[PDB]
Write a protein that binds this ligand. Structure first.
Ligand code: YHT
Ligand code: YHT
Ligand code: YHT
Ligand code: CL
Ligand code: CL
Lengths: 662, 584, 529
């Protein structure tokens, strides 16, 4: 049909063909001929994964040992495996092989917080520094199977640290630099890391950040950490190093040579742990294999973004999150292109920094979160005209829904109606892109991620019946019908939590946690999470974890945290608190509690003080009532006589109306 | 036609394989007739490189190629096969079949009480082996470690052995009937880092105290860092030691159903198997050579095809369960029946109920069991449909012509082939046996030597090989073979003193045998400076009025525990001048 | 024609290889003439990938292919060869020759007193090396560990090194003449998990205190968990520490005559060898596995002209690089017998070397000019008592050889019928740098002549730091690019390595020596600067 009765996003939406200038700027024949070749390749990646991914794994990756089986396992049994029998090394495929080919080609284009401190590392430079850091870790006893934590800002040392760890066959666990001491402690202890790599202080927005200080605070309770490597980011001599545990990056790396043999690992040996928040309260360490994850990175980076050897990628992300892992580090370095590592903010020294960077290095591909696009539209639209952005041809959006208006703003003001826009939908647990418009191939509907990617058999499940929905113009739970190379393989030392979360809810499928809709053309429209996980400015948060931090305050008895829409951050956290026995004073105190328990980025937008929370006959909190109230749907609550304290609802409603502003 | 030495063979008609064997055979037999067998055998002796090289590639999956098929000599105790090659045992027993057909049955587990019986597919087996391997790996188990197993004959024993071999470590299986002291000795000699066991066992309906005996042993086993305990009975009164003991179900739940197998060298030890007035010695088997011997013997002697189902009524506590309940059949990708209980529980028809239930085609048992069932449950055999069987194996002890006939008629219905298999823990796999559907049987004779086994009879007095037939003597083997044991753990000298030095240039089985005019071997049971002495005879001469040890000059020395000179002369004039003890 | 700078070169007639060399040669020479050598040399400089790749395949057995022949630069101290490949040193030096012909001799052992001499075949060598590795494997020694050796020059020293390399560990040989303080400094720097030594030694008929010195040093060596002690004299009053010291014979009896060798990466360290430098305490020179082995095999073959039928007698000691490269690896890699001499040139008389050469029909002899000066002074008359007609290559090493000693070496030992190879190299080069190839390069007494494959020699002006073009020149000797057997670091002190070798003249390797180059390109070593 032409009209949609379910997918209202799609009604009267004109397709947006790739502009002709995209192809004029393309350095070579595109990797895909047209949308028909894409459909053929897609159908093969579903019907015949062995014949499709086998050759691609050989083309894009360098192997130390061949694989005998392309694909094994099933979602329902949680035993997925790819490229069995094969051996390889991640740092070899990202550094060594490119350095041998051309050691002088740029690899890390590092733009520091303050541009005066920017620099460029070639592949030859990167090989030597990765080798030396790996040499230090090796002399410390790090070996295949160990885990090493990283607590660094978004700069060269973070990338070097990750690649040095993977060079030895160990798994890195990168901890976002905005995390508090308690969040560091939790992640390090769950992984039992033997070593940590960090720095003395950080630079953000021109202001100094206390990085080593928070490590010392967490490490008092991290008995498994034997040694710490400290990079002199500020060289502030007043930063204390603990004798026998802490050692300086520059001093130790000077003892070792600029080449170290990489350690061969199995395709399914763990490459890294990345701790993610879910519906649990405690963060869960998502584990990724080596071969499957790397192939997914190279494959998506190449085909969805249309990356060629001549190109330059600026992923405005942070390696503390999956987007930096896959599309600032592994994706581009696997393909041998330069990648821009930006340490600062889009506002420093002014709101043209992104564009100053793009113009400076003639970047061809730009990848950013819609939260930033909203900021630059609100505060820095006047800066764009100062910069030449004609080197760009691919503009990616990631991590949250992109509104059609922001899509248009991105298309016109950054791309000049001349670039292809790739709204990429995916997750930490998927490793790489799931649904995205391939650059130069897929026509765009603003606000739609369009078609599923190679190896991704997407489906919609009816939330009522648990049955897959045939046909288009449909809505439901977004699930995937078979595993794919870059799919996460477990939750570290807690594979049962992994099964209960992703595989068991919809047996036979993978459960994304998201709902979506499919229009008459097969285009998917993401409709946000269905498991009440909150995404604030691109950061996955656990409302359960925020409730725990608020309760830790001994003046608080009960806490209930929900998420609502926000014009700036996408979603905002609303915290409801009941006290046992101050005003904004207490509310400010609680916000700071969340800041130092989890991290500044998890602070609630607002704190509502209530006499008590609505609870069932059981004694448990009905959070549905707090969600309906917080979204000004006070009506639609329904019959509340099932509660044990229905009189509380009135107080909840009035408190939200009185305290959300103030 | 007449024998003056091998009296067993006089007037024994050959017993051709019944026609029903071939009617029940799922495919064309692997060997056409005895003449083809003789050609293949002669090559496996004269040209081991050209014979075993191709078979090693056919029957095994390799992670790294081998550059030399065969190396070393018996006289130097440096035997090695497929040098340079790398592989993994659990990959060849599980992974490769799971990829091919994950739903094909692998372990048909018959519990002590049938209500608890279940079937694991190759896909199921891969997941369970991977999860246990993940637990052990997170505990620090790695190549070169030894891990003890103290479990009954059930799925967990099989899973545990394969998970240990998946990491490149060596499993040391300890028969679940052993005492605390027997556990203690074996664990300490092997210096095991971990132990896998269960809380209690079920045998004949009665509960056995398994974990309790382990705790008693482990008080003096400092090398054991952690123990994995399976809830076989879930008896809550069974104590676990904080910080050491962890539950199988709890820990395996933390890890995924796939774990990369760890490649090992062809000559890396696959397992240690301790023997029962001697002190227990850990017989060590290589990885590649042992596996090939298992697959090769299982395939050709038993005539195993992919469609078949093997019931080895043995226990992994002994070599028979190791090779023909686990490795042999799983290497070939067939189902294997793991029976936890006794032949009497819940009644004396259980074996036959099991064979009927799963339509087993191959049955392998010790004459001791056949004597029991003949004495107490003969009437139960006919109650069950046993027409799926075509091969009936006997192992571990001589099968008398009388028992052979009873086995042939009441179990086989004069329609099956009987394979009297002779071998030892140290040989890894069959040495002398009638190939099913190929070799005619003489009841009580193991018949011909197997591929790669150059059998001979040695005069025990002179150490000289006996030429010709109608002969008797010490059973010895003239060259090493792929599945031959490689050492005794951390005691290679005892290995040399036992197998290689008594008759230098040969392997000494410890058994006597006779060879008749047709070449059939008849096992006849167990038997200083080149002169053989009898410790028993020196004790007798001294009593009318002794032990052996290694010696760097005279090879071995005899120590017997004015009068000392009188006794030495007594032994010289009773036995012989060269038979005097070194010291009295 | 005339030299104004290289005064050593004026009026020095070339000395061609005697005819009897080519008569005693068992097979067609590996290089026909000097002109073919220069075509090969120029390829080894202009095309290292195309020259050394095939030679790496030809001379070494691999467990994994390599993907890149050469990587890195002198200026960044990140040189690497045969990247991605794996192999094992003991497999190439023992196993593969045992399989081919186990009865061929490998170690021709001449003890301090000849009555105790014996010969190990490659089959015998493999069984012994396996048993010792089996001992170390059971002790926890594994790839990445370092194991110290404190043994005289005899079979056990050779066996211990090969057994340590069989497991993928690095052996740190400590010359048996070192004091306890020297042992202490070396063992601690390397953090050795185990030590292999003996109870006592035999040197010139006298007993030496070996275990006693180890015990005095080990009181300050916490990392050493276990010690393996060989019974050289079997003196029962030698104390072994309970729980730490075990006997060689007692432990090897427990293990089988074969053990699988452990694969190591091309650039995994094969050994540490501690040198005395101009800067304080000893420094652990580290050598790769593939690069070093290729260099040892390639130079042994082409400079000495070694063939399968030949027998090499390197009268050195494995405490030093000369014994590492040319008493052990070089010859064993090529599957020829090597003569391991424990005693002195003086005991029981000054005809010991020659009695050995005659005894075993040695075709190659390799010694330091210090021994030549000793024998010239004291043992010249003994040379005529022994048949030395099997020799055809006479090597000099470790120090300049004066034209006088050269002539003496040439006439009384070589009988004016042998070729003389004055080899110049260092511990840090792994193998020969400059030497006259046997049967190829005519000699100028006192000159090492031309650089070897992959060695791009040059002279630098010490004052200006600029390479000196043209011949008839003097200055600091340097190399313009790294070579396969070049040392890769100083253990846990890569900065000392960069400061010593790579930084003085960036872009070059600094040999620490001064030299001169004459109009014919022959190099004249002028000693340390
Ligand atoms: C990537 C990343 C960060 O991964 P993660 O931090 O795991 O968050 C994953 C969740 O982010 C949301 N999301 C991500 N990309 C889009 C998109 N293009 N359109 C709409 N929603 C999107 C969904 O809710 C995902 O499940
Ligand atoms: C198998 C097994 C268990 O191996 P193991 O427990 O080592 O006992 C090995 C000894 O068993 C006896 N034996 C084994 N098979 C037969 C046979 N077919 N006919 C006669 N005797 C036999 C011999 O004495 C063996 O040396
Ligand atoms: C080999 C070795 C031992 O290596 P090492 O002990 O490091 O000493 C190395 C130094 O010995 C001197 N040297 C070595 N060989 C010669 C020679 N043929 N002609 C002149 N001088 C020589 C130089 O000074 C070297 O740099
Ligand atoms: Cl005994
Ligand atoms: Cl006597």
């Amino acid at each position: 049909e032409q009209t949609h009765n379910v997918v209202h996003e799609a009604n009267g939406v004109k397709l947006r063909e790739t502009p002709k200038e995209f192809f004029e700027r393309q350095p070579n024949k595109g990797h895909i001929h047209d949308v028909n070749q894409y459909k053929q390749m897609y159908e093969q990646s579903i019907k015949d994964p062995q014949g499709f991914f086998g050759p691609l794994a050989k083309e894009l990756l360098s192997w130390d040992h061949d694989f005998h089986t392309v694909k094994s396992g099933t979602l329902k049994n949680g035993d997925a495996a790819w490229f069995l029998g094969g051996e390889l090394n991640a740092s070899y495929n990202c550094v060594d092989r490119h350095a041998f080919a051309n050691p002088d080609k740029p690899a890390l284009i590092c733009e520091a917080d303050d541009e005066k401190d920017s620099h460029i590392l070639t592949y030859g430079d990167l090989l030597r520094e990765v080798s030396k850091v790996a040499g230090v870790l090796q002399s410390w006893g790090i070996k295949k199977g160990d885990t090493v934590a990283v607590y660094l800002p978004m700069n060269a040392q973070a990338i070097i640290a990750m690649l040095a760890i993977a060079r030895l066959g160990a798994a890195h666990s990168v901890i976002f630099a905005g995390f508090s001491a308690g969040s560091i402690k939790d992640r390090v202890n769950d992984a039992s890391c033997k070593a940590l790599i960090t720095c003395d202080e950080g630079k953000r927005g021109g202001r100094t950040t206390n990085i080593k200080k928070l490590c010392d605070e967490a490490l008092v309770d991290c008995p498994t950490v034997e040694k710490v490597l400290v990079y002199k980011r500020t060289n502030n001599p007043e930063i204390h190093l603990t004798e026998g545990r802490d050692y300086y990056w520059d001093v130790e790396t000077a003892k070792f040579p600029g080449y170290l043999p990489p350690v061969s690992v199995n395709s399914e040996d763990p490459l890294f742990l990345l701790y993610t928040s879910g519906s649990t309260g405690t963060p869960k360490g998502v584990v990724h294999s080596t071969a499957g994850y790397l192939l997914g990175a190279a494959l998506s980076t190449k085909y969805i973004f249309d990356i060629h050897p001549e190109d330059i990628l600026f992923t405005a992300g942070d390696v503390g999150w999956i987007t930096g892992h896959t599309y600032a580090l592994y994706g581009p370095l696997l393909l041998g292109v330069p990648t821009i590592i930006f340490e600062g903010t889009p506002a420093y020294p002014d709101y043209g920094r992104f564009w100053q960077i793009v113009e400076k290095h003639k970047a061809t591909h730009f990848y950013v979160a819609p939260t930033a696009l909203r900021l630059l539209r609100k505060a820095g639209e006047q800066e764009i005209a100062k910069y030449d952005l004609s080197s760009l041809r691919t503009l990616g959006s990631v991590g949250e829904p992109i509104s059609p208006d922001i899509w248009e703003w991105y298309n016109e003001f950054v791309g000049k109606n001349q670039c292809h826009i790739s709204d990429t939908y995916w997750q930490t647990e998927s490793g790489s892109h799931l649904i995205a418009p391939l650059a130069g191939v897929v026509p765009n509907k603003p606000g739609s991620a369009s078609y599923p990617f190679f190896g991704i058999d997407a489906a919609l499940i009816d939330p009522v019946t648990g049955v897959e929905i045939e046909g288009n113009d449909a809505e439901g739970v977004l699930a995937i019908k078979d595993h794919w190379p870059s799919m996460a393989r477990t939750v570290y030392k807690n594979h049962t939590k992994y099964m209960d979360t992703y595989m068991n809810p919809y047996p036979g499928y993978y459960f994304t946690g998201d709902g979506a809709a499919r229009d008459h053309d097969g285009y998917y429209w993401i409709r946000g999470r269905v498991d009440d996980v909150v995404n604030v400015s691109g950061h996955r948060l656990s409302t359960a974890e925020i409730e725990a931090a608020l309760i830790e305050d001994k003046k608080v008895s009960e806490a209930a945290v929900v998420g609502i829409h926000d014009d700036i951050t996408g979603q905002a956290v609303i915290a409801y608190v009941a006290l046992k026995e101050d005003s904004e004073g207490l509310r400010k105190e609680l916000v700071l509690q969340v800041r130092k328990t989890i991290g500044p980025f998890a602070a609630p937008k607002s704190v509502i003080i209530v006499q008590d929370l609505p609870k069932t006959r059981s004694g448990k909190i009905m959070r549905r009532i707090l969600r309906k109230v917080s979204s000004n749907e006070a009506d639609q609550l329904g019959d509340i006589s099932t509660l044990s304290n229905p009189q509380s609802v009135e107080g909840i409603i009035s408190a939200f109306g009185a305290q959300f502003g103030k």
